From a paper:
BEST1-4 proteins are expressed in the plasma membrane and form Ca2+-activated Cl- channels by assembling as pentamers. The channel comprises five BEST1 subunits arranged symmetrically around a central ion pore that is ~95 Å long. The diameter of the pore varies along its length and contains two constrictions, the ‘neck’ and the ‘aperture’, both of which are lined by hydrophobic amino acids. To address these questions we determined a series of cryo-electron microscopy (cryo-EM) structures of chicken BEST1 with and without Ca2+ in activated, deactivated, and inactivated states that represent the major gating transitions of the channel.
The structure is determined to 3.0 Å resolution and is indistinguishable from a cryo-EM structure of Ca2+-free BEST1405 at 3.6 Å resolution. The neck is closed in the absence of Ca2+, and notably, it shares the same closed conformation as in the inactivated and Ca2+-bound closed structures. The overall structure of the channel is very similar to the inactivated and Ca2+-bound closed conformations with the only notable differences near the Ca2+ clasp. In structures with Ca2+ bound, the five Ca2+ clasps, one from each subunit, resemble a belt that wraps around the midsection of BEST1. Without Ca2+, the majority of each Ca2+ clasp becomes disordered. 3D classification of the Ca2+-free BEST1345 dataset yielded only closed conformations of the neck but did indicate a degree of flexibility in the channel between the transmembrane and cytosolic regions that was manifested as a ~ 5° rotation along the symmetry axis. This conformational flexibility was not observed in the Ca2+-bound datasets, which suggests that Ca2+ binding rigidifies the channel. We hypothesize that this Ca2+-dependent rigidification may be necessary for opening of the neck. When unoccupied by Ca2+, the Ca2+ clasps are disordered, the neck is closed, and ions are prevented from permeating through the channel by the neck.
Residue numbers in the entry:
A (entry chain C), B (entry chain D), C (entry chain E), D (entry chain B), E (entry chain A): 16 to 299, 305 to 339
The structure:
């Protein structure tokens, strides 16, 4: 199963390492052809004493430390951001059953509550993602996709605040469910409070995405691991050359014109640096798909599925 | 205890590494017999300078880094997927006691609720597993096993959605428990809300299996660790040869016809790569057993065990 | 404090490594005496070229990787199993106060509830432990210790299920607390539901021990780390010999008749493999003590301590 | 994306390593010029035998261990402190809806509750941060920013306690919400208890910041990793010198006047020590911004947004 | 900031490593003076062949593995024990408001409840700490500090149990709050159950300290890492000697009379073993301070702060 995953291209390592590899191939053979064709005899001698100096400081081992601890923090943080995505499904199961009414008003009342829950999720995704920000560059594009009505857009800007306004529909939700309770649509206080708790569960997950994006991996700690990988390949552009074996240096007794086991270390060390680079901004998760799923499912379960059940009949294991 | 676990075959390392080992044995002795029998005297000399080149780039240590951090992420993620399995037992203890009625209707009413809870678990297991998907290739096979009645199958397809419909029975559950409350079968709002919370507990565990399967370990990070293991064994097909000791190379002063301590490194490095490969798709967990347990226990505890208790008598420690 | 913990014997490393060490001492000096006394002069020469071959493949470093990542997964999983032990103390504090009645019936009613909670814990401990399984080999031994009355034993076998029946008393609990509520012993629905939630808290902890035991560390991943430790000591039975220093091999210029710094590596590498071996089955935790504590405390707090409090008098800090 | 993050200055590694680098450059070339210009011929010989001694104890590898495990504990603890920040948004959604009243009193009553919640967060941030402590050096500065009224300041000092008084407004909150319930402003006990639970959720997050600051990474464990980095660079001020290549030492056959691959190890090892140093006091998080956001949003959502909703009209997906 | 933390003494590494260092200095120069002054010429020769044998088995790298994984488990477990400390503040906010009454009885009733909560925390701290056990050697010392009245001391010993009796006041709490509810002091069942849940939250944190102390890091795993550190310094007492450079051994061409870079490895390896040793018994946390804080704050907030609030006046941001 791992033996066949090398041959895939889309989303693989070769599409991602296609540009940095051809730079490394170009800077390798250019230095080699200067040594092989251009430089004079004593100038070949000055290069060989420099390549032996560069070949010692390419210790493979302390580069493998800093890539291991860095990437393991990136992937761990990447898993926490997916667990912090607001799924509307817990509010959806309570709005669909405890907000009573099957007339025009109570149907409109349920559809407004689930449209506030998704709006409290879109307005944080368009600040932490670049794909959702390209889908909704302004607030008018949110109105065009029907997440926000033209009456809610005007109220959204009279509320004047210099901060991120993702918390606006999560206060509109709880004020509408109390207004729904005081008209008889929600029966009890216990059922009202159960709806208000799953709001604050989703309020807190939108408050984690608001925190993981703004507080990233430290920029100084990114820059350490990129120097040490580029420093390793810096010495390998000089140290891993094939010299002339006539001068009997230790470890250069065969010319091969191409370092096979050095270019495989490029797809190891630089490829394990591109792991952390692809995951440090994981929103450029199909989040345009994610919004289309959550909006379509939520409005479905509270409008087409409110108190209309299949017929209760006996199953196959009846006694 | 660890001393005797080497000799087991079923589920061991030797059943899993039987094919990749005989390829490695075949590619080893074939290269050796070309050096020993076919190649001429100067052609033996060109091989020996290539084997000394290959023997240096087989550094054992930076391969052991990338297998350690990779497999430790695989096993950690493997443990989270087992903790995310929906057990019906928490809903089962509340449906069996608070959904009152011992006539034909209330018995049918309890058995429908626990059959929706298992159906909200099967429809996510047949998307994350290949064994359950072979057990239920279509939705008609779910009806044949009695998880879904022929009235619920027709309602399940009138609900039109281009997404995974595992959320359908978790909305049918909460709408039936509210209908059960408004006929007098559930007594209070506090007992109704307690049933609706354990639904959303199981709704969230089905929503983790929906996430761990679709969002896997990154494909680029799989492909790094498989190059570096196969690159290590690539140099060992050339570097670990037994040369002629007459030419006095350092570390080749004895012919043995079989590298014992290299083939043990195959069962170390390739065997510690097969650990992550067996765990990255752990559903191909006896999940056909798991569904048969959860369905049989849930229907048992709400139908044979509703309010029929053993006789209250004094225990052994009575004063 | 660490300086004195070497000298302890009970539960130490020397009681655990007493058998594997004397095998390693025996296989060492036997190979040495063949080289020193039995083999001829050319046969001494063939051994010395084999010991130089074995001494290179005993790289200490890539063995220390696979023991570090393996044992750190074992100890982490070992800590999760202790946090998953059902303590009855949360149910005990609610049964002792909200299940009213001080006559013969309500006293019997409280003692039955806490005896179901411990029985829902014993029946999972006798499947995950070998010590509790030796304490209770059958179900009749559970009746002899008074956990199960002879009326509950007959009901326990009329309930026919091919699976583990630890879930039986956790359904008996919730059906008895509803019967207690409908006789006036529990006052309200809010107090009933609070008792039924701490049942499902303990139901879920018994459902983790049901999962950590059946789903272990993978058998292929155990077998990797035991080959690599035994392969390391395999080369050290040949490579770490003291040769004749007259032939001037590099690193053999002194005979000592006993490798002190190799036998210390046995108590390092094999001793750090016995860490994971002692922890991978941690039930062979004083779980016979644990059951005796939980049963005695639970029946105490609901029978001797129900609504009988010390006298309310003023403390030392009164104003 | 990682290729361009090297060139940034603000918040990068070069602003942080500007002072320690020029000390290291100064102590390098000063020792070199003493060897090159000042010392006599035999005194050059005594230095060269000292530089060969220093060059062996600069093992790069066991320094990379202790920096990896240390920094990974620092960054993990740094992520826990951001998850422990009290956001007022969960209390804000319940105070804005369940504390009824639109007259002068109930508007004043809501604004007092959210001003106690922020005050229970500021008084712990001015003990764990130095930026908030510079913003509020005394308690009078808290009154000047309007967090505390001049009547609450006098009560705050009559309460005499030798400890940190951050727990004072979290007891004032719960006593005011009970007084609000007993005047009819909060309707039920279920809605009162829901407000009192989100207080204790925020009480516990303020109790984590009270614990992460006082209980830090151990001072002995900080001092280990700083010796080992400074010891590594101590040997490199002697060992990494360019000697005279006329005396044919192994690894000194070329003069370069500047160690390029040693100064890159300064920006690797010392730069990966400055990662943990910047994160071990992460409050010197824009916490002056954080207080200005939370105070302005909380008073907004309970005063301008209490029960004043946009007009319920049909969305774009109406049928 | 890290540059100045070397110079501190109190709580540093030098106070902790003052005894083990002077032993290591004494055993070093004693062996050196035997080689330099006492032993004869051939006896100097037998030492030099032993020091070359000892210098190879002091591989720095596989000692750094076992200290890294061990200490990272110690510090992780050390952080969990601080998060498991029972703070009384969540019970304190509910007892201070929902236990009504301002006369002599209800004031006495509140002060008894918070004195049971601290007593359920002290009786577990005097079993897991040695400082609290020295503060309270018996149960009579608990009465002298006013935690337990002389009426509660007599009831505490009539309850006969061979186990740790820390669970006694956590059952007295819940029985007193039910007695307070049935006299009209607590209003509703919802407010009673909210007090009984924060008891079981604190009951579970006292049940973690009861578990982290009794179930420690395994004794076999402590003893591994202490052999391997002491074995490393064992070879360094022989291998790191300065020999006579007249005999031209590789790596001994300069006498220095003091190994500077070996004694720095003592403050690295032994100092990183003292990290885990100081943290494995972290109670010998200012827990005498902790009890004095929690008792004084809890009795304060329920007696001086019950329903006596500051005057509601308008803040600075009024409109």
């Amino acid at each position: 199963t791992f033996s066949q995953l090398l041959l895939q291209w889309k989303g693989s390592i070769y599409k991602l390492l296609y540009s940095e590899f051809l730079i490394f191939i170009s800077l390798y053979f250019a230095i080699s052809l200067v040594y092989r064709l251009i430089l004079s005899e004593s100038q070949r001698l000055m290069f060989e004493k420099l390549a032996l100096y560069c070949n010692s400081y390419a210790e493979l081992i302390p580069v493998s430390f800093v890539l291991g601890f860095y990437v393991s923090l990136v992937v761990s943080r990447w898993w926490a951001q997916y667990e912090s995505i607001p799924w509307p499904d817990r509010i959806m199961n309570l709005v669909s059953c405890n907000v009573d009414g099957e007339d025009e008003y109570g149907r409109l009342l349920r559809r407004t509550l689930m449209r506030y829950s998704n709006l409290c999720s879109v307005l944080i995704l368009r600040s932490v993602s670049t794909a959702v920000y390209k889908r909704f560059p302004s607030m008018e594009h949110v109105v065009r996709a029907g997440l926000m009505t033209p009456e809610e857009h005007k109220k959204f800007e009279s509320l004047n605040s210099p901060h991120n306004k993702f918390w606006i529909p999560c206060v509109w939700f709880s004020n509408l469910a109390v207004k729904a309770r005081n008209e008889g649509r929600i029966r009890d206080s216990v059922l009202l409070q159960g709806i208000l708790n799953e709001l604050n569960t989703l309020r807190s997950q939108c408050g984690r995405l608001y925190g993981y994006d703004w507080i990233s991996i430290p920029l100084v700690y990114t820059q350490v691991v990129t120097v040490a990988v580029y420093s390793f390949f810096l010495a390998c552009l000089i140290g891993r050359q094939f010299l002339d074996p006539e001068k009997a240096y230790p470890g250069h007794e065969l010319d091969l014109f191409v370092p096979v086991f050095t270019f495989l270390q490029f797809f190891f060390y630089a490829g394990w640096l591109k792991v952390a680079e692809q995951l440090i901004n994981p929103f450029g998760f199909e989040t345009n798909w994610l919004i289309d799923r959550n909006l379509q499912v939520s409005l479905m379960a509270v409008d087409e599925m409110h108190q209309d059940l299949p017929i209760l009949e006996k199953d196959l294991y009846w006694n």
